[PDB]
Amino acid sequence: MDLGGYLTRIGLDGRPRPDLGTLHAIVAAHNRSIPFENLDPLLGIPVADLSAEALFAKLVDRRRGGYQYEHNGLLGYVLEELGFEVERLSGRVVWMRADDAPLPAQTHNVLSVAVPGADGRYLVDVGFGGQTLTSPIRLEAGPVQQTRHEPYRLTRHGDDHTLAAQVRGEWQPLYTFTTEPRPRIDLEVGSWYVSTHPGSHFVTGLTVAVVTDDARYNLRGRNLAVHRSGATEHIRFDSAAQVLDAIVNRFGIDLGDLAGRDVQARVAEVLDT
Amino acid sequence: MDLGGYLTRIGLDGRPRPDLGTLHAIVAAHNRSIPFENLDPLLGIPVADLSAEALFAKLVDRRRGGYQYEHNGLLGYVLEELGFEVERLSGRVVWMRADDAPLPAQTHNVLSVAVPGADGRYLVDVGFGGQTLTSPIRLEAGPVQQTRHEPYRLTRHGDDHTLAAQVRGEWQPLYTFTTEPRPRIDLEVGSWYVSTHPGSHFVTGLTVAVVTDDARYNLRGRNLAVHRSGATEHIRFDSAAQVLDAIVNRFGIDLGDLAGRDVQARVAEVLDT
């Protein structure tokens, strides 16, 4: 594949080896280089094709970001090519959901990754957005595990795992998942739903995110949240133009890709959704 | 009156001539260089002495900021020494007060400045905090006047003037005042009230502010608001430690003269007040 293109995109060079050190370095570089964004579903463009060709073309060659299926799909292919053993998993997002809420749809995709020298498996997820994992963690229920940012924890009931993050001193469940490997088509059916259902969070508004060594950035509509050590920031943009400026210059997304779609007018509709 | 310390403090040099250009330059330099702060009243230290000796020693020599009486007190002495003619005025703060609110106390102090060779007088106020005037304006009721930032406007009913600012598109009355010149003692009585009454805004919590060319900054307790072109920001500090960090490193306040008074514990008490 075009790993050279991917490695350049994320600010690495040369062929890295399939070891744990490389896994950490790639996750960190991906985190800071390729943003989470849902401009395609926002603009009525489905995310239907999760092939390597499609994902490299968009997230690497066209300097766009993507959402969960695009991020982890891409990284899945990259890690495989490099020599890691990769299974694609699906999950249900429970973030900020009430204790008694209906069961969510399977709308997430994460990776279970092994190094050739079988020291168990690692959860890898660079596609959850602003609160995405910034390190690989051991796919092992029980222990609190440190990362490049906040502590995270896996717990399980049978094969139903829950990933939680310690967000500003408070533990928050993010999503649940099983370890049953999923074929690409089942991920594509999920992605069709998330990118086209008129009630989908990723159809009804705009989410853009990126994570640097120092901070998590998460834009929803006009509202940019920043979580840094010791402080939160909330930046409220006045209008769609400022949002578009942030998209291009803060988040590094080329909107030339979306010529003739009236991005600015659609962003205006979702400032507060 | 040595003015060299003051001029260095605000990032100017030499001896500027008492003209309109100098008045604009000094206001702008003061705005960015000496912050609004009420650390003394917060810590039970009254602001009682508005002599040149007291105000220069604190706001210049000790690299502290100050509140309304200290700012406009200091600038009044500076402007007189340079060859301007200065009257000190008092006023009542009406910002965000209901139409049927009781009459406020006289808690503000502003300057009416005559520039040699120029008609009329100029309102100068570098002590109102985050929304303080960033240009001198003509002390003339009626016309909308441009500043380095937003438009401001004086209006008059009898001898009571109202200063208003167009804040993010909305006209907001800030304070009322008369043009009766005030003796220092009457200002000191006001400052005694503002710095010692247990219900005073400047006794019950922490207020720090500064204004740069690009933004207005206003901190209350743990909450920093920023108004800039196209956006507002709200930064929430985790604890007093980060607030003190901001006081020293962002606002440039030397806390050395407060050694031995446990500034951090007092700030901790008022993060949410």
Swiss-Prot record, chains A, B:
Reaction equation(s) it catalyzes: an arylamine + acetyl-CoA = an N-acetylarylamine + CoA
EC number: 2.3.1.5
Name of this protein: Arylamine N-acetyltransferase
UniProt-listed InterPro entries: Arylamine_N-AcTrfase (IPR001447), Papain-like_cys_pep_sf (IPR038765)
One Pfam family in the UniProt entry: Acetyltransf_2
Gene designation: nat
Domain of life: Bacteria
Function noted in UniProt: Catalyzes the transfer of the acetyl group from acetyl coenzyme A to the free amino group of arylamines and hydrazines. Substrates include isoniazid, anisidine, and 4-aminoveratrole, and to a much lesser extent, p-aminobenzoic acid.
PANTHER family: ARYLAMINE N-ACETYLTRANSFERASE 4-RELATED (PTHR11786:SF0), N-HYDROXYARYLAMINE O-ACETYLTRANSFERASE (PTHR11786)
Enzyme class: transferase
Signal peptide coordinates: none
Organism of this sequence: Mycolicibacterium smegmatis
Consequence of changing H108 to A/R/W: Loss of activity
Assembly mode: Homodimer and homotetramer.
Keywords: Acyltransferase, Transferase
GO molecular-function terms, A-Z: arylamine N-acetyltransferase activity
SUPFAM superfamilies to which the protein is assigned, alphabetical: Cysteine proteinases
Similarity-based family: Belongs to the arylamine N-acetyltransferase family.
Active site: Q68, H108, D125
